[PDB]
Amino acid sequence: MSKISVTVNGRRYPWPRVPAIAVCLDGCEPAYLDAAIDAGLMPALKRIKERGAVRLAHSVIPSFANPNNLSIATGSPPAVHGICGNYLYEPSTGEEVMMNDPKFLRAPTIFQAFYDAGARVAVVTAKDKLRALLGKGLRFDEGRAVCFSSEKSDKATRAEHGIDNASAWLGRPVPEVYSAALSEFVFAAGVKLLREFRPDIMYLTTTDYVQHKYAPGVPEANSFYEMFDRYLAELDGLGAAIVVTADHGMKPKHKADGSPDVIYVQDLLDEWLGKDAARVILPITDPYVVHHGALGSFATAYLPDGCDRSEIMARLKAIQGVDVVLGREEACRRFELPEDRIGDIVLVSSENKTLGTSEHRHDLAALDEPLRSHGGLTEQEVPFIVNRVLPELPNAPRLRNFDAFFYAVTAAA
Ligand SMILES: [Zn+2]
Ligand SMILES: [Zn+2]
C-alpha cells in the first residue's frame, strides 16, 4: 500500500491518522510563554514542551496577521498566496482597495485541498475579516467543513459556515472584539469541535488585543496564557497532534516617557521630493482609521516616476531607527513577497521604533498604556511547539510559522 497524501502549493501533506491542529497565538512573543510557565500557570504546556518538540520559528515579513495567517493556511509565503497587508494601493488611480476579500488570495489553502480530498476541516478565527479569506474554497453541503469567527459567531449559518449560530451552539455570548474573551471563545469552540465534529485538520487563530496592552509576565498577560493552557490541556488529552505557533511576536515601541517613538516617512519624502509625490503605505491598518492600532515597524513606498531610488534609500538608511531599506526587487526576493503588490522601496524600523505617515494635522492617540507593536524583523521570532516527539524538526531560520500544518500532519501521520 502506498501512503496517502495531499499536495498543496508544491508541498506534500501526509494524511493525518489523528486530528491535526495548528493554534496561532496572535502576537505571542516567546517571552509570554516563558513567564506564564515560570509562574506555574501552564502545567500542560510545560509538560508538552518537556515530552514533545520545542523550537523557535520565523514568521513572514511584514510580521502582521494577514500575511502570516494566510501563509500558515497555505503553507507558502506571500509571493505565492498574494496577501502581504490589509490593503493594496493602486498608483494610477490613487485607490486604496481593501485586502480582506478572498478574491485577492491567489493560491489554495491547505483547508480546501484536504476538503476536496474528502477530509473534515475546521477553521475558527477571533476576528471575522480573516474568516472569509481563510474559508476560501470550503463548502458546507456535506457536513465536512466548519468555518466561523468569535466576532460573528451568532451570524453563522449551516449553508455559509457549516454551523447554525456558533454562539448558541457553544453556549457562550458573542464576546467584545477588544477583549481576551474574543480569543477564549476560539479555544472553547476548538475543543468542542474536536470532540463533536472530529476534524482531520483544524486551525485556531486569535487576536493580539492582550499582547498590544500588556508585557510578558504582568498579571493580565499571565491570566490570558493560564486560560489558553486549560484548553491546550483538553485538546492534547483528546489525542490530537498539535502545533502551537504565532503570526508574529511583540515588542515595546516607546520612548522613556511612555510615548510612541515614530519616524514619519511621508514627511521625509514630502520634504525631499515634494508633497504627495510619493505614497507611503502602512500595511497594519485600514488607512481611514484614526487610532494608534495603526502604528507598526514595516512600511512600503511608491515613488514618483524617474526619481533616483538609490539616492532616496541612502537618505532613509542614514536615519537612526531605520534598520532596513530595500528596492522592490531585493525586498521581494529576500522577504518572499509579490512584486505587483509592493512599493518601489521597503522600510523596516528598529526594535523600539515604529513607522508612520505624516505629522502635519497628525494622527490621534488611542489607549493609556505605552505602545507595543510588531511588523519588523524584531518580531519575526515566534514559538513553535509540537506535542509529539520530532527530533528532525528544524529550528529557525529554516523553520517557519507557515511550516505549522506540514509538521502537525506529519506528526499526526
Ligand atoms: Zn497578529
Ligand atoms: Zn497586532
mmCIF file of N, CA and C in Angstrom, residues 3 13 34 83 86 110 126-127 136-137 143 149 173 202 215 219 255 266 280-281 300 318 322 385:
data_model
loop_
_atom_site.group_PDB
_atom_site.id
_atom_site.type_symbol
_atom_site.label_atom_id
_atom_site.label_comp_id
_atom_site.label_asym_id
_atom_site.label_seq_id
_atom_site.Cartn_x
_atom_site.Cartn_y
_atom_site.Cartn_z
ATOM 1 N N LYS A 3 1.445 5.301 0.569
ATOM 2 C CA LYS A 3 0.926 6.228 1.571
ATOM 3 C C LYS A 3 -0.006 7.255 0.932
ATOM 4 N N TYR A 13 1.502 16.814 1.938
ATOM 5 C CA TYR A 13 0.990 16.606 3.308
ATOM 6 C C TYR A 13 0.492 15.174 3.489
ATOM 7 N N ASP A 34 7.283 31.743 28.447
ATOM 8 C CA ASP A 34 8.313 31.517 29.475
ATOM 9 C C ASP A 34 7.865 32.026 30.848
ATOM 10 N N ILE A 83 -1.237 37.733 -0.262
ATOM 11 C CA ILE A 83 -1.678 38.592 0.841
ATOM 12 C C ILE A 83 -0.483 39.157 1.617
ATOM 13 N N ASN A 86 -3.105 44.617 4.736
ATOM 14 C CA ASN A 86 -4.561 44.752 4.870
ATOM 15 C C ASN A 86 -5.218 45.473 3.698
ATOM 16 N N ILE A 110 -4.487 24.919 2.475
ATOM 17 C CA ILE A 110 -4.401 23.524 2.905
ATOM 18 C C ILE A 110 -5.806 22.999 3.232
ATOM 19 N N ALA A 126 -10.831 34.559 15.566
ATOM 20 C CA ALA A 126 -11.426 35.511 16.514
ATOM 21 C C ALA A 126 -12.111 36.656 15.747
ATOM 22 N N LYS A 127 -11.377 37.288 14.839
ATOM 23 C CA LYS A 127 -11.938 38.365 14.026
ATOM 24 C C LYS A 127 -12.544 37.852 12.730
ATOM 25 N N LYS A 136 -11.810 30.364 2.133
ATOM 26 C CA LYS A 136 -11.931 30.295 0.670
ATOM 27 C C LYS A 136 -11.878 28.863 0.147
ATOM 28 N N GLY A 137 -12.877 28.492 -0.650
ATOM 29 C CA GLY A 137 -12.888 27.174 -1.303
ATOM 30 C C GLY A 137 -13.545 26.074 -0.495
ATOM 31 N N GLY A 143 -21.535 18.480 5.365
ATOM 32 C CA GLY A 143 -21.234 18.381 6.792
ATOM 33 C C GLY A 143 -19.775 18.064 7.095
ATOM 34 N N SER A 149 -16.107 32.950 12.884
ATOM 35 C CA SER A 149 -15.334 33.752 13.825
ATOM 36 C C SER A 149 -16.082 33.864 15.142
ATOM 37 N N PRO A 173 -21.884 33.802 25.094
ATOM 38 C CA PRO A 173 -22.244 35.040 24.406
ATOM 39 C C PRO A 173 -21.166 35.462 23.402
ATOM 40 N N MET A 202 -7.620 21.193 11.643
ATOM 41 C CA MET A 202 -8.279 22.328 12.288
ATOM 42 C C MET A 202 -7.300 23.439 12.534
ATOM 43 N N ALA A 215 2.743 43.622 28.731
ATOM 44 C CA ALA A 215 4.036 42.973 28.585
ATOM 45 C C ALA A 215 4.009 41.567 29.173
ATOM 46 N N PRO A 219 0.203 40.653 35.353
ATOM 47 C CA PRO A 219 -0.932 39.794 35.712
ATOM 48 C C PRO A 219 -1.921 39.496 34.568
ATOM 49 N N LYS A 255 9.356 55.603 23.755
ATOM 50 C CA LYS A 255 10.392 56.350 24.466
ATOM 51 C C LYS A 255 10.208 56.216 25.979
ATOM 52 N N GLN A 266 6.255 59.837 5.360
ATOM 53 C CA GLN A 266 5.604 60.693 4.368
ATOM 54 C C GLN A 266 6.232 62.090 4.394
ATOM 55 N N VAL A 280 3.416 56.676 0.939
ATOM 56 C CA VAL A 280 3.828 55.720 1.970
ATOM 57 C C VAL A 280 2.637 54.865 2.410
ATOM 58 N N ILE A 281 2.817 53.542 2.393
ATOM 59 C CA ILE A 281 1.761 52.600 2.782
ATOM 60 C C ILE A 281 2.114 51.843 4.076
ATOM 61 N N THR A 300 6.051 50.447 3.159
ATOM 62 C CA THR A 300 6.469 50.441 1.771
ATOM 63 C C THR A 300 6.107 51.779 1.114
ATOM 64 N N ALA A 318 20.336 56.252 6.401
ATOM 65 C CA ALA A 318 21.180 57.104 7.243
ATOM 66 C C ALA A 318 20.460 57.622 8.495
ATOM 67 N N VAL A 322 15.891 53.449 11.464
ATOM 68 C CA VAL A 322 15.570 52.788 10.198
ATOM 69 C C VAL A 322 16.640 51.732 9.904
ATOM 70 N N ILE A 385 5.874 24.869 18.967
ATOM 71 C CA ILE A 385 5.921 23.776 19.923
ATOM 72 C C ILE A 385 4.965 22.689 19.452
#
